[PDB]
Design a protein around this ligand. Sequence first.
Ligand SMILES: CC(C)(C)C(=O)N1CCN(C(=O)C2=CN/C(=C3\C=CC(Cl)=CC3)N2)CC1
Ligand SMILES: CC(C)(C)C(=O)N1CCN(C(=O)C2=CN/C(=C3\C=CC(Cl)=CC3)N2)CC1
Lengths: 114, 121
Amino acid sequence: MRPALYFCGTLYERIVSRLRRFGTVLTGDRLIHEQDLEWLQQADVVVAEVTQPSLGVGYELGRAVAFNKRILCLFRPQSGRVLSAMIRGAADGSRFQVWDYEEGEVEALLDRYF
Amino acid sequence: RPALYFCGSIEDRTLYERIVSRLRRFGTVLTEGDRLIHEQDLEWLQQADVVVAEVTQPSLGVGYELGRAVAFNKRILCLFRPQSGRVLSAMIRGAADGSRFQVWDYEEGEVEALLDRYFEA
Ligand SMILES: CC(C)(C)C(=O)N1CCN(C(=O)C2=CN/C(=C3\C=CC(Cl)=CC3)N2)CC1
Ligand SMILES: CC(C)(C)C(=O)N1CCN(C(=O)C2=CN/C(=C3\C=CC(Cl)=CC3)N2)CC1
């Protein structure tokens, strides 16, 4: 099966270029929300870069958990930030995973996950 | 007693205290290692009758809570300050339907009158 992939967040372009080798990458304010929710529902795996705080990214992860999607969150500790306890605490190590990473290992990590 | 859930990114504290003081007049405010925090948060979110979120500061936690609340069909009120100089995320602004999910723009001074107006309907 070729998974439908959803990505949210030049580092993003490196991530999406690697994601493209495993499946199709799907990615008025009300129109944006409705289009976003249609893609989230079609996706087989939801990939989120969670290093920068975002209400949009968090909202997408919450809607994705309720649809029981496979989720992968990517966080850079070298950013100097401490990841939200709600994102870090949502991980179960299987369907919802939170991976700490360094800029240079983007491609090897995505290869290892898929 | 109606159960109210309040969230906001964590100066901001004193504005949050004014919000929670006003919320307390309409019901019990549930929100007054990391896995334990998440599980406790999800138990409160499920018990809530209305979810109140201050969405002026970007937060992954607040956004995650709103997303889980929408999937539970909760009545939701988001409070945003345009005078902060920020542009509210199109996902939060776009999630509003004007009834079950509402996004209200406000100025610091109208906190109490706005919460009175929402809970008097
Ligand atoms: C390289 C690309 C793929 C362009 C990238 O950097 N992305 C990261 C930022 N990003 C998002 O976080 C995101 C999630 N949903 C949406 C939209 C939903 C609906 C509509 Cl109409 C527009 C956008 N955006 C888009 C993908
Ligand atoms: C004055 C108070 C009420 C203290 C305030 O400023 N608050 C606003 C910020 N805030 C939150 O965004 C929030 C949502 N859920 C939680 C927790 C969930 C689980 C556990 Cl174990 C602890 C907290 N926190 C806490 C409440």
